[PDB]
mmCIF file of N, CA and C and ligand atoms in Angstrom:
data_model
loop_
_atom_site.group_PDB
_atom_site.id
_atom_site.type_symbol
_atom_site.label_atom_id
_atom_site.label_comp_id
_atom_site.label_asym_id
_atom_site.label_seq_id
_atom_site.Cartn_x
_atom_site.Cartn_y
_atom_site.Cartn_z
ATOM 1 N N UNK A 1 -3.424 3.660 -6.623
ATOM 2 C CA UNK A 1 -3.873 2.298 -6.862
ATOM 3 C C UNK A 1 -3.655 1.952 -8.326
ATOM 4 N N UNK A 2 -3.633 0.720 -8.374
ATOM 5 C CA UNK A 2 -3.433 0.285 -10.130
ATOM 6 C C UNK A 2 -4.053 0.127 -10.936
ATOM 7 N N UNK A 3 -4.733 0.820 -11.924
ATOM 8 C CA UNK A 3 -6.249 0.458 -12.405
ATOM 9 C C UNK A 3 -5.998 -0.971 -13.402
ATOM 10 N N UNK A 4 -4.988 -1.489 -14.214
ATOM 11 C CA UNK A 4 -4.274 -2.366 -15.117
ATOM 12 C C UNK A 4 -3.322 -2.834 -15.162
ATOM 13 N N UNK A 5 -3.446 -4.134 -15.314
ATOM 14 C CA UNK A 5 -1.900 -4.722 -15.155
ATOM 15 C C UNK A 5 -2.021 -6.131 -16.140
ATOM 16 N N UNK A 6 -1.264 -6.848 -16.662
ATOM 17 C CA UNK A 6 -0.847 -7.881 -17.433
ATOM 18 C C UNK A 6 -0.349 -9.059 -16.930
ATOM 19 N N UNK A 7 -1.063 -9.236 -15.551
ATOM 20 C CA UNK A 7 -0.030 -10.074 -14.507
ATOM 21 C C UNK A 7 -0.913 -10.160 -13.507
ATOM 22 N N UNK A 8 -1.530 -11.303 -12.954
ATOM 23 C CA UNK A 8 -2.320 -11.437 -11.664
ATOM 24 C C UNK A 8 -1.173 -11.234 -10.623
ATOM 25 N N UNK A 9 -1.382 -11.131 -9.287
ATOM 26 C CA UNK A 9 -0.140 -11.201 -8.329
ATOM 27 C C UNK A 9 -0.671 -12.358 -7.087
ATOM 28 N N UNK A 10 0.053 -12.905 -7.257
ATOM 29 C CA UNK A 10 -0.128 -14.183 -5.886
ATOM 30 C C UNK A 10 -0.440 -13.685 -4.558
ATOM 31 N N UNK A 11 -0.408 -14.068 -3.296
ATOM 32 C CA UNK A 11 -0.916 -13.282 -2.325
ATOM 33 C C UNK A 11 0.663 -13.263 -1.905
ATOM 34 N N UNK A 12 0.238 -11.881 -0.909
ATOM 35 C CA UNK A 12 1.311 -11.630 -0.342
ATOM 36 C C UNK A 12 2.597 -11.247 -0.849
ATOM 37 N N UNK A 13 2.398 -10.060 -2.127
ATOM 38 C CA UNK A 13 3.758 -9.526 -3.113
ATOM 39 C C UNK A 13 3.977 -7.941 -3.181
ATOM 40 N N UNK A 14 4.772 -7.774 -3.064
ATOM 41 C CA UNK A 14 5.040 -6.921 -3.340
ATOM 42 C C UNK A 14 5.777 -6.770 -4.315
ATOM 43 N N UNK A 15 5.539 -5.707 -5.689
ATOM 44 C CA UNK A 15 6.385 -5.939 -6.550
ATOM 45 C C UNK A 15 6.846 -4.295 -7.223
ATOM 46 N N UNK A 16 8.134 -4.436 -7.589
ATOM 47 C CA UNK A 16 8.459 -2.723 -7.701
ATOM 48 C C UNK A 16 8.370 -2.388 -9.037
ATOM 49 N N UNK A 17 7.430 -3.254 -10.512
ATOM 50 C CA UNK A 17 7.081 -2.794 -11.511
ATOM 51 C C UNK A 17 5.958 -2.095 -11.310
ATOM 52 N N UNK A 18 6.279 -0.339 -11.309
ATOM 53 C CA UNK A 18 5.295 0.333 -11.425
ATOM 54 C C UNK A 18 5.565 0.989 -12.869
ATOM 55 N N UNK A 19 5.980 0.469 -13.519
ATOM 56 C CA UNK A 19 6.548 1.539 -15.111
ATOM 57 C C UNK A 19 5.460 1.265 -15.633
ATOM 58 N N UNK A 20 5.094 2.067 -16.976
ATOM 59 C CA UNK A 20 4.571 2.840 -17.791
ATOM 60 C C UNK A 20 3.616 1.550 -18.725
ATOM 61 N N UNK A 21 2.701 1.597 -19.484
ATOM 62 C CA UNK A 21 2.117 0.851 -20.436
ATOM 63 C C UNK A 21 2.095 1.390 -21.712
ATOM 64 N N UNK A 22 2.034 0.236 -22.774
ATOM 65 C CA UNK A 22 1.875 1.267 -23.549
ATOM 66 C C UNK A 22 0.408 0.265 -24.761
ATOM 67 N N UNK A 23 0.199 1.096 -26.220
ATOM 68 C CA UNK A 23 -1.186 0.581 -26.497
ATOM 69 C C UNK A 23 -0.562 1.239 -28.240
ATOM 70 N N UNK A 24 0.198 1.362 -28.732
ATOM 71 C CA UNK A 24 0.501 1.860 -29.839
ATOM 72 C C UNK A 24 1.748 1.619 -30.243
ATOM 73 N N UNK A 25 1.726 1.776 -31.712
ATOM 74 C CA UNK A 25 3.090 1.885 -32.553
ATOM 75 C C UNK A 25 3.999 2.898 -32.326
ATOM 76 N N UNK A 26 3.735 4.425 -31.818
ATOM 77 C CA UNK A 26 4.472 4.986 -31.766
ATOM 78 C C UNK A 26 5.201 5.184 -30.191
ATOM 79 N N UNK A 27 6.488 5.269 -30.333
ATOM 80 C CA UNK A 27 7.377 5.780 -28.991
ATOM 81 C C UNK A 27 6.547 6.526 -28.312
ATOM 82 N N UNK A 28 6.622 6.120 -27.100
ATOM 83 C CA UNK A 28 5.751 6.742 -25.664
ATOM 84 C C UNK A 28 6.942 7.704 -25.005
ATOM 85 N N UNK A 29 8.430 7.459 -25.017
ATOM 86 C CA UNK A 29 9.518 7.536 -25.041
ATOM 87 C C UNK A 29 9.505 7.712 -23.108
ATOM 88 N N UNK A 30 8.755 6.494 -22.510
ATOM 89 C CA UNK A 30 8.514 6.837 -20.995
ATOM 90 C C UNK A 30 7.683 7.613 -20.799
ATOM 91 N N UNK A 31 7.115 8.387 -21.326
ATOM 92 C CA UNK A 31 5.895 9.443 -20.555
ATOM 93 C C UNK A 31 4.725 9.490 -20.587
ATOM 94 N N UNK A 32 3.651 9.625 -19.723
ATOM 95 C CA UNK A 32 2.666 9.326 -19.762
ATOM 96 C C UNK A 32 1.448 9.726 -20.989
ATOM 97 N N UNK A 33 0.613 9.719 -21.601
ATOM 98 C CA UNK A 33 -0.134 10.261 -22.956
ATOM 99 C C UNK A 33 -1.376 9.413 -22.734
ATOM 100 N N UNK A 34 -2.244 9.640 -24.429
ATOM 101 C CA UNK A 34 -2.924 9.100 -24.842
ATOM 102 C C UNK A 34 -2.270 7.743 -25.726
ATOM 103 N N UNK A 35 -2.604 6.888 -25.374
ATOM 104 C CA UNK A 35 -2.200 5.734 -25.894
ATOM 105 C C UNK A 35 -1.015 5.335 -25.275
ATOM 106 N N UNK A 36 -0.515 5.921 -24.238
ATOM 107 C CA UNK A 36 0.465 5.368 -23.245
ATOM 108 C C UNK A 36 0.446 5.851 -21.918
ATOM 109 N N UNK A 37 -0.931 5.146 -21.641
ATOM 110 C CA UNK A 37 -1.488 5.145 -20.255
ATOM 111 C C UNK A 37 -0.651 4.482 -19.101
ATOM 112 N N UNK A 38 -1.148 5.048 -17.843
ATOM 113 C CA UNK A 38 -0.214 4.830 -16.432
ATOM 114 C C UNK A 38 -0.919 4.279 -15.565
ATOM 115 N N UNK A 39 -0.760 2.695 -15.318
ATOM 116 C CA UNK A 39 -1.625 2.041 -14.340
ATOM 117 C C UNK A 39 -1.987 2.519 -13.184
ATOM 118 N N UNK A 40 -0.814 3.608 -12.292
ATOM 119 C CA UNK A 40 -1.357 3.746 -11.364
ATOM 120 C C UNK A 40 -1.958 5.629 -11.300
ATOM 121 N N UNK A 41 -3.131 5.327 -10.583
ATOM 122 C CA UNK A 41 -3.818 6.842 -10.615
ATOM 123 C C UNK A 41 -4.652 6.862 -8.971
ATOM 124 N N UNK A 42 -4.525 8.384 -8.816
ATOM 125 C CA UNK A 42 -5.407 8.017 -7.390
ATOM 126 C C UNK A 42 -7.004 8.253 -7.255
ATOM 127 N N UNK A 43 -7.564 8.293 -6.333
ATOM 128 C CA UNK A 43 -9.260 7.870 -6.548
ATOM 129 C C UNK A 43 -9.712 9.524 -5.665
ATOM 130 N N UNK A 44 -8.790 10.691 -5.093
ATOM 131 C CA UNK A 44 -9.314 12.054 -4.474
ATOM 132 C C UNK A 44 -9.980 11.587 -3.373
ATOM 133 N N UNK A 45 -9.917 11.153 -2.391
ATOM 134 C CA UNK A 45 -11.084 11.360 -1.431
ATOM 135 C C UNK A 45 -11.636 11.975 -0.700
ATOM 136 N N UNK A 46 -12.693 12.170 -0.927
ATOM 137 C CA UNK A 46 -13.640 13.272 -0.288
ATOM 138 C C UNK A 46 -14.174 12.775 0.430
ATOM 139 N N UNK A 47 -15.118 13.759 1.515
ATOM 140 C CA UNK A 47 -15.729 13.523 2.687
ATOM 141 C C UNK A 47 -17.314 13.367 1.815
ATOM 142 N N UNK A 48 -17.696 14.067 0.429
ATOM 143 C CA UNK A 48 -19.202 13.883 0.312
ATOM 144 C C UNK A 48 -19.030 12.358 -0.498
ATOM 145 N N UNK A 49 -18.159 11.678 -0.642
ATOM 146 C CA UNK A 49 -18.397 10.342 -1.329
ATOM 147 C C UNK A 49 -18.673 9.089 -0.344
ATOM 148 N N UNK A 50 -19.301 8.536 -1.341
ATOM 149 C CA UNK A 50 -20.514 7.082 -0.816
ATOM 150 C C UNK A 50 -19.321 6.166 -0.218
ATOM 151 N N UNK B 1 14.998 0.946 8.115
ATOM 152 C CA UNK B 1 15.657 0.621 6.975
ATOM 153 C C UNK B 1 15.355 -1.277 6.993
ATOM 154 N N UNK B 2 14.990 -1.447 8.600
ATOM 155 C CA UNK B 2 14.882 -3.381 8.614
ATOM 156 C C UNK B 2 13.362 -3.258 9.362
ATOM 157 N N UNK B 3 12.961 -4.540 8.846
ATOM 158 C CA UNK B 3 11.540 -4.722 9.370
ATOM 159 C C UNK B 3 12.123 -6.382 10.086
ATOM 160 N N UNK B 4 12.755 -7.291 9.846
ATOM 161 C CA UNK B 4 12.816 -8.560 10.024
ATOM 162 C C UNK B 4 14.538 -8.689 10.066
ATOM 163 N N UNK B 5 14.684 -9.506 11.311
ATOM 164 C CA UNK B 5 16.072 -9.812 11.626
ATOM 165 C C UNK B 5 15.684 -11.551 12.340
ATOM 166 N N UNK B 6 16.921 -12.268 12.047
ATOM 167 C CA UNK B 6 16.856 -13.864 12.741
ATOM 168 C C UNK B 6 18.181 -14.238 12.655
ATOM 169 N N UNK B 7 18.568 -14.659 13.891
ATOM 170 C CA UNK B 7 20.224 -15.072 14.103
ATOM 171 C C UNK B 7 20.011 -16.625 14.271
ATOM 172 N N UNK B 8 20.054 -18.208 13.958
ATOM 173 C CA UNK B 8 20.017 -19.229 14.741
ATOM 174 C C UNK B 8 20.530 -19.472 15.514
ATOM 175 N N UNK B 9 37.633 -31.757 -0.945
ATOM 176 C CA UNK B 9 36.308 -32.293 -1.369
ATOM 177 C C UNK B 9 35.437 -33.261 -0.255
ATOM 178 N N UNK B 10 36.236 -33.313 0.681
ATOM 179 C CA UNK B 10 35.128 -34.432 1.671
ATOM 180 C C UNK B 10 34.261 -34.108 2.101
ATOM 181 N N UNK B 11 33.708 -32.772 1.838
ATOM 182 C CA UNK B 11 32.057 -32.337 2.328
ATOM 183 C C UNK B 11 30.909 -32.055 1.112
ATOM 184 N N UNK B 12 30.027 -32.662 1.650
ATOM 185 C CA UNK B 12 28.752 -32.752 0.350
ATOM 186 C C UNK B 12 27.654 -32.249 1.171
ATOM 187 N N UNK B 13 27.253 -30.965 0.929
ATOM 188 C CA UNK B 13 26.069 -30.355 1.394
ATOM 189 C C UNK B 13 25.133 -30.019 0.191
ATOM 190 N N UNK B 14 23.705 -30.439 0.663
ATOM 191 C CA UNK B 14 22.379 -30.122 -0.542
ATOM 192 C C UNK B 14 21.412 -29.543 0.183
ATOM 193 N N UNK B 15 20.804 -28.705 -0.243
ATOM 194 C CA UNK B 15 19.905 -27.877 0.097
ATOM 195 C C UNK B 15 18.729 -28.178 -0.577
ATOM 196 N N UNK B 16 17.599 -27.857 0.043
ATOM 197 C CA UNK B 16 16.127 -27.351 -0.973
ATOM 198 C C UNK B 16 15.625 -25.931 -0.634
ATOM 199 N N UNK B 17 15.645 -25.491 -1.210
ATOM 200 C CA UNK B 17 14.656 -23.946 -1.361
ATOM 201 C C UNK B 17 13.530 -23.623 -1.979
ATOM 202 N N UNK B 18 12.162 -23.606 -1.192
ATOM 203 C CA UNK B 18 11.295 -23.140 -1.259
ATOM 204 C C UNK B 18 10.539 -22.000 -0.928
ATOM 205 N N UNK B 19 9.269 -21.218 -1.870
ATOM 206 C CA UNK B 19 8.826 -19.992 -1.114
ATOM 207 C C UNK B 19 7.723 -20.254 -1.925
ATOM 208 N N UNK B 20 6.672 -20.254 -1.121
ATOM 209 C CA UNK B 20 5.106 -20.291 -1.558
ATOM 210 C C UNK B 20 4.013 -19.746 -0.404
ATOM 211 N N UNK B 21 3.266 -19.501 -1.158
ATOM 212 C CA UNK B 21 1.833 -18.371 -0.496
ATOM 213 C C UNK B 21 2.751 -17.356 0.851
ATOM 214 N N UNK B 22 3.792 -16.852 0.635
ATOM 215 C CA UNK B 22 4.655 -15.384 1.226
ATOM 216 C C UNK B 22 5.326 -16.771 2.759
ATOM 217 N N UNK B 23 5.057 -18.116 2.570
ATOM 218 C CA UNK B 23 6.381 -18.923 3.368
ATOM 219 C C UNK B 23 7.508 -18.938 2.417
ATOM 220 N N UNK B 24 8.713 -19.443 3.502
ATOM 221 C CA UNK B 24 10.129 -19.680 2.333
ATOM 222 C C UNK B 24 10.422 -20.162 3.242
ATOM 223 N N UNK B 25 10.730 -21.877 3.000
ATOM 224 C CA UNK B 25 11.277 -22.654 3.708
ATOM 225 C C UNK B 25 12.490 -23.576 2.957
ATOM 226 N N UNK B 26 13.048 -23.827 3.717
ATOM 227 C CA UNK B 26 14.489 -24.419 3.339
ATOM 228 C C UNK B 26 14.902 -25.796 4.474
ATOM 229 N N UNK B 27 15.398 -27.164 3.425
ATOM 230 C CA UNK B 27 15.780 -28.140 4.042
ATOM 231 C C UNK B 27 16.919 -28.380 3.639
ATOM 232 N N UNK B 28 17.755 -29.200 4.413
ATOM 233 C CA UNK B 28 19.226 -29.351 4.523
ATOM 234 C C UNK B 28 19.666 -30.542 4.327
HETATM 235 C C1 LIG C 1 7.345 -10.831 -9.615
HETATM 236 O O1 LIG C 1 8.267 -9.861 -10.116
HETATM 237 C C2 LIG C 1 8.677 -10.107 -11.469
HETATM 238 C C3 LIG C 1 9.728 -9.074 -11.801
HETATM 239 O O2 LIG C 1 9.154 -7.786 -11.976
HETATM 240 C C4 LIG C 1 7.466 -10.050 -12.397
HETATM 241 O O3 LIG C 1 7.886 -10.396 -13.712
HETATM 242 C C5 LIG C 1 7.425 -9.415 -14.662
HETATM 243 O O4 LIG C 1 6.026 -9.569 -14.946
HETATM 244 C C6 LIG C 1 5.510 -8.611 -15.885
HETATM 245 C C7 LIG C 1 4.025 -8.862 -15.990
HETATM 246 O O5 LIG C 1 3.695 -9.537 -17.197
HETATM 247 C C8 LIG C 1 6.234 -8.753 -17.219
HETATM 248 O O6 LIG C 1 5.758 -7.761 -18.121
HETATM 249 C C9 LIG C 1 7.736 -8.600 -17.021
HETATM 250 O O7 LIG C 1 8.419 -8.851 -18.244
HETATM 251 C C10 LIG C 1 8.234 -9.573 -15.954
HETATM 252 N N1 LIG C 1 9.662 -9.402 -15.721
HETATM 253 C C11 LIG C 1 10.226 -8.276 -15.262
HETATM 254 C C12 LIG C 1 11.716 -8.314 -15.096
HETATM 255 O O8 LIG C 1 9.570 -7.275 -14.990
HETATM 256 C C13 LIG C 1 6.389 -11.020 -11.927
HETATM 257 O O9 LIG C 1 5.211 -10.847 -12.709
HETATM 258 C C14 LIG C 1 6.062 -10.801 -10.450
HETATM 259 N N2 LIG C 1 5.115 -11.802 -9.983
HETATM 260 C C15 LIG C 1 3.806 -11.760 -10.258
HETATM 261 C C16 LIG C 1 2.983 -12.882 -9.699
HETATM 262 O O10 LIG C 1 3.309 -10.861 -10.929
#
């Protein structure tokens, strides 16, 4: 799922920007870090969660 | 690989193309 994005999406889109963010001056050079966080992450689901 | 398939100088043809809330309609 996407936790951030820079862009509301209209209904009904599908869209194939899943690349990288970034939050700093220095080259991320594509890979994921501190200060060049990755919108999408998954949530584990377990059987003991609410 | 397909989810959706649909089969239906003296010429001046105009079109309109539209696509809003996931319609896309087109007049001739
Ligand atoms: C529909 O897709 C286009 C193409 O990806 C989206 O346009 C991008 O939007 C992001 C969000 O701000 C920008 O950072 C990019 O620069 C835009 N262009 C490209 C080529 O990626 C557009 O946002 C999508 N529609 C909606 C409603 O989000």
């Amino acid at each position: 799922y996407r936790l951030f994005r820079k862009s509301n999406l209209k209904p009904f889109e599908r869209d194939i920007s899943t690349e990288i963010y970034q939050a700093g001056n220095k080259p991320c050079n594509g890979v994921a870090g501190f200060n060049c966080y990755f919108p999408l992450k998954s949530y584990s689901f377990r059987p003991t969660y609410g | 690989n397909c989810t959706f398939e649909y089969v239906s100088f003296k010429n001046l043809r105009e079109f309109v193309f539209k696509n809003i809330d996931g319609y896309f309609k087109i007049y001739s």
